[PDB]
Design a protein around this ligand. Structure first.
Ligand SMILES: O=C(O)[C@@](O)(COP(=O)(O)O)[C@H](O)[C@H](O)COP(=O)(O)O
Ligand SMILES: O=C(O)[C@@](O)(COP(=O)(O)O)[C@H](O)[C@H](O)COP(=O)(O)O
Ligand SMILES: [Mg+2]
Ligand SMILES: [Mg+2]
Ligand SMILES: [Mg+2]
Lengths: 464, 93, 464, 93, 119, 93
């Protein structure tokens, strides 16, 4: 019957003999308990306060079947190479979650548990999303295959430039830079993540002039061109108003900042994109606030899975070699989780769980930030074809300007593709391939000379 | 198209790479090479199970003789992923 | 003219002689640089990559007036008591930001800078939001004063219960527990943060039965009752559909999980609440993912300011004494920033900047999580009148059930109010006041006995 | 209303607390004490600058004599914040 | 500010000369839909003042005659023409008829001159 | 365009006026001079900090030699106001 009062969470929420169901959501938590708190009790608190339980016994439990609703820690993995850490594996029944709601899934699993007094730190490392739950989500509006078919672009990574300076340019000046980047050989240009609508440049003026720039550059080059028009907005109504105008202008692609806008707005937009044949580029602004430190937060691989479910056609994945952090092992893992249909468990690449995506479309990887022509062989080798390589300063910072800047990057990419398709080792012959192509391309030669000495080499925080 | 025009040895080397990966080559042609043109006209059928890159080049030559006023390109596709994995123009009229 | 290539950020973005304008947005960043990176260069990188600049010089800068658009570090404060840390003070011009967009403000200031290779860690501690920018936001739909007037409740904190178990109860059982809590003396009950719409309980069924429960409990007690119906949803359309139904049922209050849903959806809902006379309770689920650790993330005081701007009538502020972390000094500071019109700089309470709210309505503080009747004198003393005190397990875990559980908490509060209004010291006479009231209340007596030994005493991570 | 009924000394102690904080006492009455009733009828005017709690109790007695069939409560407000800061029933008919 | 004070008996006369609108209040207004810089960018017209003609007589012209006058004014080198302030919609000329014929005139004048025209 | 065609001395005098005001000259070209064409193709980069009008004329000549079939104009902009402050055609093909 009903026994009032406090008892240990582990009595109900630690179940080492439980075998997970194929319908269960699985979570891998890196847990750092306070001194004197047993691993089993910490793991059980996490399981409890992210599912059904609270700090004291409630009678209302007996109205229902707590045993079939509760989350449970079914495995504990000590991490002897770490200071007072372990991995808690937690299973959550399918029935706990709202169909098609990334928002609900995160509210349960990461809602309250990270601030628990009895923990020093907590990090969500991975989630196993069951096939039965995945089927309740749209996923990407289009995905890699459909995007390539819509754009008629095959056999190589796609290329983009971010317009700079980040803020301060007029709408007319913005469109001018777009036309020049695109005509020079880039497939895409883009709004900076923080270009929405501002006193120096209102969104509707920007959208209009960018559309003019695309039409001119597309007609001149004979290649399909795009610009990720940023629809990130104060409200859902304003977000959709901007997306609708891009549609009215027959723009092929828009962008959205999924974390700063949020998953509810993003899921709305992803559905709108599917309904309207609009490609959706996703910027991951704010991710490093949550995902950088090993001891606490949410790993990007989880945020990436959540984005694939909510929906996006492209997502930023880091560069490895550029100005922003991205460990190679960690990156290759979550790149696979974003693009592939079936990913086998692999702890060497941070893949805690085998993930079956049940034919949910894959997301294009986007490598952006502090990269230039010298990085091209490494970028091609790391990411492969199904990626977009973006050069902001690496284009607009070219000695001769935008159009040459674009041509420099386009030549550099196509040379790296040809060389790879000839059987050459891009990691060995990297510098040689760039130097070979520089002879034919004065644009490339000038780009190479300017950025020869520029490397970003620091110790990564987010590592295996 | 941003590189110097390819030689026959370079073209055959690109085609062989596709074959080695298990991709299926196909030849198509059109009056314009503009990317806004969604569909090109297929030459015969895709060359399923061609292990020789020369056999692909042979179909290009036969297509060129019948249609000298048309652009010709070679494409390869992955049937498992069902996607086109390469495309490059081999002849400009 | 145009000089292509890489140069130090500090040459443009470190301006120690700059005096901030009253229209500037100010940021206080706790910065941990990589070894060999000078403080001035790290601070300048943060200022640059959160405003106008990129890794290399762009010609397009010269089209505009970079000097009047750039962010800049105007002050550096070494922290000798810390390991390789300093505070960077950064000023951002008003023109950089989209009017009424918390989403845009965060995208700029926290968008990319946290993942910079040249940093080991970075934490946003505070923001000074200028009056001119604040005037572009609605702020709370109602605010403390208007809420009290709508509810006709004065002179004491308000009381609520969260229904438990978190998940697994049927809609009918849910409404039953609501009726019992409310008739027992609580002003409010609430959906758990993760109760949205699920296989065990669909939202419309819940909303209906909760409305029945409120009507019955309101008629029986003669006091206005409410239940925060959770409208947190997969999409904006679904969120608004649920809010609209609550309005149709004439419910006085709804709740929303602002971070898991996101600021775009939240700003939409806040405007809808203002338009519809709906009170908006805000749950801060996921906050501790970002805000717990001293070295990295975003302090809650910043998230709280952002919520006040986007809009909410209540927001969770922690308990100090309950199951979840909340340092007293840190808490009193951000409680003031949420409720008051003018808050003076005070580093002892983590207030880095003086904040003028320009008559933007204040937000009710909500203390919730692992609290019971013994905590009442401390809760009253810490938070004062303009707070809501919530007891989930502390109500439903009472030896005799819900209605007695509610009465126990209501008696305990009203006794603490009377005692305080008589001039008694709640921190000294705390236990005495509870014991005095226990004589008159068998409900209280039973609650006291059960939870006598229950304390949550751990070292806090988020401290001054 | 969940505590034992207040004595005159307890009522005066509550009122004095308001005065000491700088709040302005006011007396109002109504036929019902239901919270759905938005407005009660104001007795005279708010007692601005009353330093004595007995003066407030005096107005309560005078109100009770004229309206014995009505509920009576004492409220205090902060004019700077413009909000009501206390409200408690002093007489039930 | 100007609601009631101008009719106060205790005054003989009152004139409001100026207002200082604070930055914080200004931020609550849209202001111009476009403004100088954006308009020039939209019209592709730089380096000089713009030029216009008001169609005359003020009132009394048919829609078709109005359009003819617009075509002639614009083809001759003016950037803009315009309705007189009191031309709205009237028995001698209904607005929708005017709008249509004016649009015809703009299209023809713009094609012939290769400059952007408006009315 | 409603005045007689400008001489080289008149063109240089217009350009010098821009320089004297602190404006930044730039050269652009297009196949058509129609105003419905939103963007012309930029010749190199804007001449930032050119104090000599002849240096601007030099870039016009170099542009004309490479593109004799294109219209060429000189524009100047104010970077502080971020607006184009002059535009006049210098060469018709
Ligand atoms: O704002 C920027 O810095 C960028 O536009 C890069 O510009 P540059 O090409 O000029 O460096 C990208 O948004 C960041 O790389 C985002 O980081 P991530 O992809 O890791 O999310
Ligand atoms: O789910 C829970 O645990 C609670 O309902 C409390 O229930 P109990 O009253 O039974 O403990 C609250 O949501 C948390 O306190 C939120 O934390 P915070 O207020 O710090 O955001
Ligand atoms: Mg960017
Ligand atoms: Mg809860
Ligand atoms: Mg007139």
């Amino acid at each position: 019957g009903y026994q009032a009062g406090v008892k240990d969470y582990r009595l109900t929420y630690y179940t080492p003999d439980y075998t997970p169901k194929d319908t269960d959501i699985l979570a891998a938590f890196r847990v750092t308990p306070q001194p004197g708190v047993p691993f089993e009790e910490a793991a059980a608190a996490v399981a409890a306060e992210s599912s059904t339980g609270t700090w004291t016994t409630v009678w209302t439990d007996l109205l229902t079947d707590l045993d079939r609703y509760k989350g449970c820690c079914y495995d504990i993995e000590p991490l002897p190479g770490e200071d007072n850490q372990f991995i808690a594996y937690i299973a959550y029944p399918l029935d706990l979650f709202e169909e098609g709601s990334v928002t609900n899934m995160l509210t349960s699993i990461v809602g309250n548990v990270f601030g628990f007094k009895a923990l020093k730190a907590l990090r969500l490392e991975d989630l196993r999303i069951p096939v039965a739950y995945l089927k309740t989500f749209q996923g990407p509006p289009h995905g890699i295959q459909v995007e390539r078919d819509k754009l008629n672009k095959y056999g190589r990574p796609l290329l983009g430039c971010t317009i700079k300076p980040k803020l301060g340019l007029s709408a007319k000046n913005y469109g001018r830079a777009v036309y020049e980047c695109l005509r020079g050989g880039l497939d895409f240009t883009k709004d900076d993540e923080n270009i929405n609508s501002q006193p120096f440049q209102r969104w509707r003026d920007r959208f209009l002039f960018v559309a003019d720039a695309i039409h001119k550059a597309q007609a001149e080059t004979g290649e399909i061109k795009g610009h990720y028009l940023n629809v990130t907005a104060p409200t859902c109504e304003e977000m959709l108003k901007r997306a609708e105008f891009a549609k009215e202008l027959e723009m092929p692609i828009i962008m959205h900042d999924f974390l700063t806008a949020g998953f509810t707005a993003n899921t709305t937009l992803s559905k709108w994109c599917r309904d309207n044949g609009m490609l959706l580029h996703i910027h991951r602004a704010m991710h490093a606030v949550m995902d950088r430190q090993k001891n606490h937060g949410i790993h990007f691989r989880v945020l990436a899975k959540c984005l694939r479910m909510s929906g996006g056609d492209h997502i930023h994945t880091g560069t490895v070699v550029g100005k922003l952090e991205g460990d190679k092992a960690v990156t290759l893992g979550f790149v696979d989780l974003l693009r592939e249909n079936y990913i086998e468990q692999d702890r060497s690449r941070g893949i805690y769980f085998t993930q079956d995506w049940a034919s949910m479309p894959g997301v294009m990887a986007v490598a952006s930030g502090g990269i230039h022509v010298w990085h091209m062989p490494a970028l091609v080798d790391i990411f492969g074809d199904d990626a977009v390589l973006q050069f902001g300063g690496g284009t607009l910072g070219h000695p001769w300007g935008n159009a040459p800047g674009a041509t420099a990057n386009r030549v550099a990419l196509e040379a790296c593709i040809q060389a790879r398709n000839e059987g050459r080792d891009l990691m060995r012959e990297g510098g040689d391939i760039i130097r070979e192509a520089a002879r034919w391309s004065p644009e490339l030669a000038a780009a190479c000379e300017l950025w020869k000495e520029i490397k970003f080499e620091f110790e990564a925080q987010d590592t295996i | 198209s941003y590189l110097p025009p390819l030689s026959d040895a370079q073209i055959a080397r690109q085609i062989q790479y596709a074959i080695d990966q298990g991709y299926h080559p196909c030849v198509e042609f059109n009056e314009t090479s503009n990317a806004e043109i969604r569909y090109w006209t297929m030459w015969k059928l895709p060359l399923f199970n061609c292990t020789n890159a020369q056999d692909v080049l042979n179909e290009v030559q036969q297509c060129r003789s019948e249609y000298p006023n048309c652009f010709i390109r070679v494409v390869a596709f992955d049937n498992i992923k069902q996607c086109q994995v390469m495309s490059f123009i081999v002849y400009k009229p």
